[PDB]
Structure formats: structure tokens, C-alpha cells
Amino acid sequence: HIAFWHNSMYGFNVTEQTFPYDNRPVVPLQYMTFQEWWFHNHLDYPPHPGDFFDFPAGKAATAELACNKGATTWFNSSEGGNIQNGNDPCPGSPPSEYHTTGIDDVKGCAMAIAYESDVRKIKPEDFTVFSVNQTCVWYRFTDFQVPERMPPCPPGGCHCAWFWIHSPDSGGEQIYMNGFQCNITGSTSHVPLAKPKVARRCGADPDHGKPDAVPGNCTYGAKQPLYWLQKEGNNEFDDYIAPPFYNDLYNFKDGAQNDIFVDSYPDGIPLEQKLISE
Ligand SMILES: *[C@@H]1O[C@H](CO)[C@@H](O[C@@H]2O[C@H](CO)[C@@H](O[C@@H]3O[C@H](CO[C@H]4O[C@H](CO)[C@@H](O)[C@H](O)[C@@H]4O)[C@@H](O)[C@H](O[C@H]4O[C@H](CO[C@H]5O[C@H](CO)[C@@H](O)[C@H](O)[C@@H]5O)[C@@H](O)[C@H](O)[C@@H]4O[C@H]4O[C@H](CO)[C@@H](O)[C@H](O)[C@@H]4O)[C@@H]3O)[C@H](O)[C@H]2NC(C)=O)[C@H](O)[C@H]1NC(C)=O
């Protein structure tokens, strides 16, 4: 039970009783229909038009992740009041609440982006993971390195989403998504992002057999988020006990994803020929 907290997020003020079911930003998404899991079904609760989360190109962007809005800077809009305590994502509860045994058992999370001012036109295939932090859901203030060559977003801004998948060894398995209005500052480029593609289970994982990574099986360009364990619209089909992660395992390098642009690979990706055969 963790959520990305900011005034530019969708469903910023959604509470337990707002919907017939519990659909608070921190509620996990599992075996849901597209409408339920996509954007956490918070499209009808958009932020104010002027509130945007800024991503400075070539610089870090601090985000707040917590089990309660009271544990973040946005506590004044939360009912419990201020309970924040430094880098603790959930004050008063242990790390099992963030679904991890320790700092070594965290599986990382990501920030995706879709260059579209109208949220209604955004499709799951449109999101591109542009920044990752592999030590995610450990620190409340989690920084995300933004690529230097990020182009400027359209007139009405663009949309982003925070995703997270945790280890199987702690609690029930699910995915996490929190969409929000974002914008890019310090842009020194106009080369757009490449059409993102499904991330393949590339890297090594001794636990599930293969101890050696398979470079030839990687997805190298722009990558889509990991949609998994839902009733509809999945791009990953791994078993409950072998979940995908925002790690080296799916070629999600720690830090900024600098190879997501059209001009990134000059000679292209010949490995995509092997995808055409299937
Ligand atoms: C190159 O990239 C590609 C793309 O990312 C990678 O392909 C993916 O590989 C995943 C891991 O192998 C694989 O996950 C599996 O999903 C299936 C379900 O998918 C099926 O249905 C979909 C329909 O949409 C279809 O698309 C698929 O093609 C499939 O037909 C699950 O059943 C699998 O779960 C079984 O395996 C796991 C893995 O356990 C390993 O580790 C244990 C512990 O050491 C070991 O004992 C075991 O032998 C394995 O080595 C198990 O944890 C589960 O319990 C399941 O157990 C199997 O074995 C049981 C007996 O032990 C059987 O009783 C049982 O029926 C089952 O067969 C698994 O999660 C993705 O589906 C796959 N995606 C695609 C698109 O291909 C590829 O790995 C990657 N790397 C390369 C090439 O190196």
C-alpha cells in the first residue's frame, strides 16, 4: 500500500468512501478490468489545470512515495494531519508494509511519460519509461534522473505515471500505478521519443534457474511499462510467483533511460529481426 503523492496526480483527494469499492491512490491493482486498473480509475478526478510535476532534463526529480498523504508534504489536504518522518515511506509501520524484507529485497520502480495533453487519448502502448530507480519503495524522497535529451511537451503539458512491482517474498502480488500531470523543463532538444515496445525478460535471475543474462533477448529502445496480473490489457504474462520488475532483469538500467529517442541508435536495433520471426 504505497502511492506517488503530488497535487498534479489524478485522484489526489480520493478517499476510501469516494467509490463503492476502495480505490484510494495507495490501493494495489490486481485482476482488474482495464477501466479499473488504468490510471487507477481516477480520470474523473483530475488535478487543477495549473498543477504540474516538473522533470528537469539532465537533473534529478524528487518524488514522494508513501502509504498516507499525511506522511508527505501534501498532508494539509489529508485528514489525519502531518505524520511525516524523514525518508520513512510509512511511519509507524515496518518495511513489510512496503512489501520488502530489507533494502536488498526492493525491486525498483519507474516513471513513464506520454506526450499528450488530453488524457482521454492516451493508450497503454503510448507510455514510455524514461526514468528508473532500482532502490525504490525504501526512501520516501525517491529521486528520478531525467534524460538530458528529453524534448519539450505540447502546449497543454503531457502526462506521466509512476509504476511499481515488488518482490514475491513479501505479501500478496500486484502492480501499482499513479497517473499525473507532468512537464519537462530545461529542454535542449527537439528529437522526439521512439514508439515504446514491450519489455522482455532479458537479464539474469539465479532464483528461477538461469544464472546468466541473455543480451540478445533484450528490448533496447524505448520500453512500455509492465502491465501485469490484470484481467485485461497485459503486456507481461509471467506467473504470479515470477513477476517482472523495473530492474536489469527487464533491461531497466538504474537512473535515466537515455536511449529512448529516435536518433539514439544510429544503425538501429538488428535484434528486432528476431522479434519479426515470431
Ligand atoms: C526472452 O524474452 C521473453 C519475453 O519476455 C521471455 O519469455 C517469457 O518467459 C517467462 C519465464 O520463462 C514466461 O513466464 C511464464 O509464463 C507462463 C504462462 O504463459 C503462458 O501463456 C501465455 C498466454 O498469454 C503465453 O504467452 C506463454 O507463451 C505461455 O504459454 C507460466 O506458466 C510460467 O510459470 C511456470 O514457470 C515458472 C518458472 O519457474 C522456474 O523456476 C523454478 C524454480 O527454480 C523451476 O523449478 C522451474 O522449472 C522454472 O525454471 C514457475 O515458477 C511456475 O510455477 C510455472 O511452472 C511450470 O512448471 C511446472 C512444473 O514445475 C508446471 O506444472 C507448470 O505447468 C509450469 O509449466 C512462467 O511464469 C513468459 O510467459 C514468457 N513470455 C513470452 C512472451 O514468451 C523469455 O523468458 C526470455 N528469456 C530467454 C529467452 O532467455
Ligand SMILES: *[C@@H]1O[C@H](CO)[C@@H](O[C@@H]2O[C@H](CO)[C@@H](O[C@@H]3O[C@H](CO[C@H]4O[C@H](CO)[C@@H](O)[C@H](O[C@H]5O[C@H](CO)[C@@H](O)[C@H](O)[C@@H]5O)[C@@H]4O)[C@@H](O)[C@H](O[C@H]4O[C@H](CO)[C@@H](O)[C@H](O)[C@@H]4O)[C@@H]3O)[C@H](O)[C@H]2NC(C)=O)[C@H](O)[C@H]1NC(C)=O
Ligand atoms: C498545502 O501544502 C502544499 C505544499 O506545501 C501547498 O502547495 C504549495 O502551493 C503554492 C501556491 O500557494 C505552490 O506554488 C506554486 O509554485 C510553482 C513553482 O514551482 C514550485 O514547485 C516546484 C515543485 O515542487 C518546486 O520545484 C519549485 O521550486 C522550489 O525549490 C527550489 C529549489 O530548492 C527553490 O529555488 C524555489 O524557491 C522553490 O522553493 C517551486 O516551489 C508555480 O509554478 C505555481 O504556479 C503559479 O505560477 C505560474 C507561473 O506562470 C502560473 O502560471 C500559475 O497560475 C501560478 O500563479 C505555484 O505558484 C507550491 O508549489 C506548493 N508547494 C509545493 C511544495 O509544491 C499548499 O498551498 C498548501 N495548502 C494550503 C491551504 O496552505
Ligand SMILES: *[C@@H]1O[C@H](CO)[C@@H](O[C@@H]2O[C@H](CO)[C@@H](O[C@@H]3O[C@H](CO[C@H]4O[C@H](CO)[C@@H](O)[C@H](O)[C@@H]4O)[C@@H](O)[C@H](O[C@H]4O[C@H](CO)[C@@H](O)[C@H](O)[C@@H]4O)[C@@H]3O)[C@H](O)[C@H]2NC(C)=O)[C@H](O)[C@H]1NC(C)=O
Ligand atoms: C534513487 O533515489 C534515492 C533516494 O532519493 C537517491 O538517493 C539520493 O541521491 C541524491 C543525489 O545524490 C542525494 O541528494 C543529496 O543529499 C545530500 C545530503 O543531504 C543530507 O543533508 C540534508 C540537510 O538538509 C538532509 O535533509 C538529508 O536527510 C541528508 O542527510 C545533499 O548534500 C545534496 O544537496 C545537493 O543539492 C544542494 C541544493 O539542492 C546543493 O547546494 C548541494 O551542493 C548538493 O549538490 C542532495 O540533497 C540524496 O541524499 C540521496 N538520498 C538517499 C536517501 O540516499 C538516488 O540517487 C536515486 N537513484 C537513482 C539511480 O536515481
Ligand SMILES: *[C@@H]1O[C@H](CO)[C@@H](O[C@@H]2O[C@H](CO)[C@@H](O[C@@H]3O[C@H](CO)[C@@H](O)[C@H](O[C@H]4O[C@H](CO)[C@@H](O)[C@H](O)[C@@H]4O)[C@@H]3O)[C@H](O)[C@H]2NC(C)=O)[C@H](O)[C@H]1NC(C)=O
Ligand atoms: C512546460 O514547461 C515549459 C518549459 O518550461 C513551459 O514553456 C515555457 O513557459 C515559460 C513560462 O510561462 C515561458 O516563459 C514566458 O515566455 C513568454 C514569451 O512567449 C513571455 O511572455 C513570459 O514573460 C512575460 O512576463 C514577464 C514578467 O514576468 C515579462 O518580463 C516579459 O516581458 C513577458 O511579458 C515568459 O518569459 C517560456 O517561453 C515557455 N517556453 C519555453 C521553451 O521555455 C510550459 O509553459 C510548461 N507547461 C505548462 C505550464 O503547462
Ligand SMILES: *[C@@H]1O[C@H](CO)[C@@H](O[C@@H]2O[C@H](CO)[C@@H](O[C@@H]3O[C@H](CO)[C@@H](O)[C@H](O)[C@@H]3O)[C@H](O)[C@H]2NC(C)=O)[C@H](O)[C@H]1NC(C)=O
Ligand atoms: C483537494 O482538497 C484540498 C483540501 O481540502 C483542497 O484544498 C483547498 O482548496 C480550496 C480551494 O482552492 C482552498 O480554499 C480557498 O481558501 C482561500 C483562503 O485564502 C480563498 O482565498 C480561496 O478563495 C478559496 O476559498 C482551501 O484553502 C484548501 N483547503 C481546505 C481545507 O479546504 C484542494 O483544492 C483539493 N484539490 C483537488 C485537486 O481536488
